[PDB]
Design a protein around this ligand. Sequence first.
Ligand SMILES: CC(=O)N[C@H]1[C@H]([C@H](O)[C@H](O)CO)O[C@@](O[C@H](CO)[C@@H](O)[C@@H]2O[C@@](O)(C(=O)O)C[C@H](O)[C@H]2NC(C)=O)(C(=O)O)C[C@@H]1O
Ligand SMILES: CC(=O)N[C@H]1[C@H]([C@H](O)[C@H](O)CO)O[C@@](O)(C(=O)O)C[C@@H]1O
Lengths: 171, 160, 165
Amino acid sequence: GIQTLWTPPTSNPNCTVYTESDSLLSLCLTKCGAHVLGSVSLTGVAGTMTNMAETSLAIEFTFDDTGKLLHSPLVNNTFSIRQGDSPASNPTYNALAFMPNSTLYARGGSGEPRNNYYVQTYLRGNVQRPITLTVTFNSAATGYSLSFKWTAVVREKFAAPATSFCYITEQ
Amino acid sequence: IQTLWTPPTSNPNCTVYTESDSLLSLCLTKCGAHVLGSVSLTGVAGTMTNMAETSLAIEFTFDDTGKLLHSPLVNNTFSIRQNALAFMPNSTLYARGGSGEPRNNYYVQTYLRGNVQRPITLTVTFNSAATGYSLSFKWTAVVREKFAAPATSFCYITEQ
Amino acid sequence: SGIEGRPGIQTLWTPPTSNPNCTVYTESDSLLSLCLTKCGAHVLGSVSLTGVAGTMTNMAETSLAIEFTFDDTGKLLHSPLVNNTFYNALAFMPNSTLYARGGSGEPRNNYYVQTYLRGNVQRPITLTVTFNSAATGYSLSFKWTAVVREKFAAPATSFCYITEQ
Ligand SMILES: CC(=O)N[C@H]1[C@H]([C@H](O)[C@H](O)CO)O[C@@](O[C@H](CO)[C@@H](O)[C@@H]2O[C@@](O)(C(=O)O)C[C@H](O)[C@H]2NC(C)=O)(C(=O)O)C[C@@H]1O
Ligand SMILES: CC(=O)N[C@H]1[C@H]([C@H](O)[C@H](O)CO)O[C@@](O)(C(=O)O)C[C@@H]1O
C-alpha cells in the first residue's frame, strides 16, 4: 500500500529557505518499479522569498544509509508516508526503495552529469522568465540525498511552478 | 484500475475547431499519490492544418465526484482502460480557479511538428475550473501553419 | 545480461554499473543507463549516457544515436549494449496503433527532452526519443545533439509512452 513519500498538500507555508515558514514547498515521491516519480514546486510567501537577494536558491533533503530522513527545509521535517495508505498504526516501509541508486548516482557525485536532472520552467509562470531547476541525486558524501537548485531573479518574488523528475532507486 | 485514457487510435478522435479535425492522445496512469500523464495532439483537417490563431487550448472538466463533464473528444471515449477522485488533481495544492497560480501550472518544452525551428511551450493547468476539477492544455501555435504537438508528459499530485 | 527484467515483470533495465557497458563508436566506450517501468498503460523511462573513451570523449559529429530494436513478440533483436542480451514483453513495447511502425516522421512518435551537455548550461542539447521507427516489430531510438571537439555526456532524463499491451 505504501507507494508514496511526501509532504502533505497544504495552503499554508511549510518550508524555511531563509526565515521560518517563508515558503510553501510541495515534494512528492511515488514508486513505480525501479523508478521514483517525483514532483516538486516551491512558492515564496514571506521575506526574502518575495524580494530575492540572490540569483539562485537551493534546498536539500538528506537521508542516512537506511533511508531515514536526517535534514530537510520543512518546518518540523514533515516528510513521510501518505496517511491512509496503510490501515496499520506506525506503518513500516523500505525507505531504500525510495532512495536514489548509489551505483548509478555515486555519493559525492554532484559533479557527474548522470547524477543531475535538468528541468526548464518559468519564474512565477512568466514566460519571459525562463529558469532552470537542477535536481541532483546523492550529492551528499554519505547516506542519500535529493538536492534542488532553481535559478531566480533578484529583486522579485520567487515561485517555481509544478515540475517533475524521475530517478532509479536503490532497492 | 490504474489507467484513464482515450484509447490509442490512428484516425481523428477530437474536435478543436470542426468535427474530428484532430487526433488527441491523453492517458493518465496512477502511481500512488501521482498521476503520470501523457498527451499529444495532431492536426488532421481544416484549420488545424492552417492555423488561424497563435495558441490552441483544450480542457477536460470534471464534477466534484470526478465524473467527466466536458472534453473536446468527438465521442465519449475518455474511459477506464479495458474511485475517480484518485485521478483528480489535488484541490488543496492546486486550488480551484487557480490558473493564475504558478503551482497550478506545469510547463513543457517541445517542437511544433517536431520542427527544430519551431520551439513551443505546452502549459498544463490543474484545476483552472472554479468548481469540480479540471485538466487544461494550451500550446503555442504558428498561424498559417499546421498544428501538431509531439509526445509529451506531465505529473501531478492527486486528490485521493 | 545487458537488459534484465525484474518483478510479474515491472522493470526492464540496464543493471546499475560503475563501468562502461555500451558501444556507440568503439567497444565499451560509454556508460548507458536505461530503465523502463510499467505503470498501467504507460512505460516510464529514464535514460542517461556518459562517454568514457574514444570518440565519445572528443566528438566528431553534432549528434549521436542509438536504438533498441525488438521483434513483433517484443523480443530484443539488437541494442548498443556490450552484453547484447536479455513476463509479457508486449506490455513494455510502444503502442503500434498510436506510434505507427516506420513513423519516425510523425510528430506524435517523437518525445523531445531539453538538457545540457555534461550538465553545462552553456551547452544546451536536445534528446529525441522516437517510438517504433522500425518498419517491423518495435523500437526505441535515442538521438542526442552534441558538440564537436568536446566530450559527450547526457545527464539524467526521462520520458513516457503508451504501451502495446
Ligand atoms: C554536473 C556538472 O557539474 N557538470 C560540469 C562538468 C562536469 O563536472 C565534468 O564534465 C565531469 O567530468 O564540468 C564542466 O566543466 C569542465 C571541467 O570542470 C570544463 O570547464 C572543462 O574543464 C577542463 O579542465 C577539462 O576538460 O577538465 C578543460 C575543458 O576544456 C573544459 N571544457 C569545456 C569545453 O569548457 C563541463 O563542461 O564539462 C562544467 C559542467 O557544469
Ligand atoms: C501562472 C501565471 O499566470 N503566472 C503569472 C504570474 C502569477 O499569476 C502571479 O505571480 C500569481 O501571484 O503573474 C505574473 O504577473 C508574474 O508574476 O510574473 C505573470 C505570470 O504570467
